[PDB]
Amino acid sequence: SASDVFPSSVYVPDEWEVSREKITLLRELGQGSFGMVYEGNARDIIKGEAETRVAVKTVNESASLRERIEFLNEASVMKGFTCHHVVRLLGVVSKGQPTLVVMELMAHGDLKSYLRSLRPEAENNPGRPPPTLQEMIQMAAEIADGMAYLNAKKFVHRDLAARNCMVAHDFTVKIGDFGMTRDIYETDYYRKGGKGLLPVRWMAPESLKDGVFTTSSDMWSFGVVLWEITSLAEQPYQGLSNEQVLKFVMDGGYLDQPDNCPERVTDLMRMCWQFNPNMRPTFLEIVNLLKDDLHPSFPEVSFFHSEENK
């Protein structure tokens, strides 16, 4: 026997582990500043499905230690989430280099790019109109549901923005990009000490001031996401500097409604941009304002309608 060598050498297998050769990579779907996203195809990673289209997130070998730490923690938080409106983790490859994070493919990429492509002028226009009021309401409901779920799990996303909302083949939007996501179970807030690049244009006054992040500051970013949707992904506060935005927002400033913004959307933004974080709605309330005019499938898949929303 070599049963003494066993507990030393083979450990409890990680459920999430997929064998590297099961992954075939097709093309680049995105370059971050240190993170590649590929479209790919995977053999036998979902029970019953012989092959599964997928997105594969990696970090380049130029990744800093901090970047590797963050990707590592992004990978872990994703393991805990199961929601139709949150980008699904499907597997991890940790045996060898590079480390792959395998996720459901969101075929139309991120919302920001998607919105910009729907500008009439866009060189990459897909041949359909910009979003209808209906579609914008459906988008908002999906995003808020997904955010509602994460808040029910006691995480604050901290980086909600159209660039981090992913759009599927059927046009369903889902929250992605959990690098900045923090557990808030014990205290209901996450406080950040000083230095650390986070985009000030999506941030709540209190976060700008005290580095405090709550589900209510996610609500602030949600308003900015509504704004991107109704402006087809303009730059918020164009022609002001980050520094100028910081001051303005901390003083009570916020964005204007985009031209011809629907009154319903405008109304949600006003709620999102209440200075007092206590006064902003919850994501569950957002979904509740929208629930009567959504696709019929929404109740069958949403977090809001599920039993888990106890």
For residue 96, the one-letter residue type is G
Question: Is 210 in the active site?
Answer: no
**Minimum distance from residue 16 beta carbon to its own copies (Å):** 7
**Minimum distance from residue 30 beta carbon to Mg ion (Å):** 8
Residue 3 assigned ligand-binding role: no
Q: Is 50 one of the binding residues for its own copies (CB under 8 A)?
A: no
Residue 84 assigned ligand-binding role: no
Binding residue for its own copies, selected from 21, 185, 193, 276, defined by CB under 8 A: 185
Binding residue for its own copies, selected from 24, 28, 31, 79, defined by CB under 8 A: 79
- Give the whole-angstrom CA distance, residue 72 versus residue 264: 40
Binding residue for ligand ACP, selected from 78, 166, 225, 249, defined by CB under 6 A: 166
Q: Is 40 one of the binding residues for ligand ACP (CB under 6 A)?
A: no
Q: Is 75 one of the binding residues for its own copies (CB under 8 A)?
A: yes
* Other CB atoms within 10 A of residue 194 CB: 5
Residue 80 assigned ligand-binding role: no
Residues 89-118 that bind its own copies (CB under 8 A): 92, 94, 97-99
**Binding-residue total with ligand ACP (CB under 6 A):** 21
Residue 225 interface partner, choices ligand ACP, its own copies, Mg ion, none, CB cut-off 5-8 Å depending on type: none
- Give the whole-angstrom CA distance, residue 183 versus residue 220: 19
Binding residue for ligand ACP, selected from 23, 29, 139, 265, defined by CB under 6 A: 29
Q: Is 87 one of the binding residues for ligand ACP (CB under 6 A)?
A: yes
Helix pair angle (133-152, 283-290), 10° resolution: 150
Give 180 or 272: the residue with its C-beta nearer to ligand ACP. Answer: 180
Residues 6 or more apart from 6 whose CB is under 8 A from it? none
Helix or strand (DSSP H, E) at 103: strand 100-104
**Minimum distance from residue 268 beta carbon to its own copies (Å):** 29
Residues 65, 214, 155: CA angle, nearest 5 degrees: 60
Give 113 or 266: the residue with its C-beta nearer to Mg ion. Answer: 113
**Minimum distance from residue 211 beta carbon to its own copies (Å):** 24
| CA–centroid distance for 84 within its chain | 13
Residue 105 assigned ligand-binding role: yes
What are the tokens at 148?
């509602």
Q: What is the CA radius of gyration of the chain?
A: 20
Q: Is 32 one of the binding residues for Mg ion (CB under 5 A)?
A: yes
Q: Is the dihedral of CA 121, 126, 127, 131 positive or negative?
A: negative
Residue nearest to ligand ACP (CB): 32
Residues 6 or more apart from 48 whose CB is under 8 A from it? none
Residues 275, 303, 78: CA angle, nearest 5 degrees: 85
- Give the whole-angstrom CA distance, residue 90 versus residue 96: 18
Contact 213, 158 (CB under 8 A): yes
Q: Is 72 one of the binding residues for its own copies (CB under 8 A)?
A: yes
| β-bridge pairing 173-175 and 155-156 | unpaired
Q: Is 306 one of the binding residues for its own copies (CB under 8 A)?
A: yes
**Binding-residue total with its own copies (CB under 8 A):** 37
Any idea which residues carry the catalytic annotation? Answer: 159
In the annotated binding site, the residues are 33, 57, 104-110, 163-164, 177
> Which residues are known binding-site members for ATP?
33, 57, 104-110, 163-164, 177
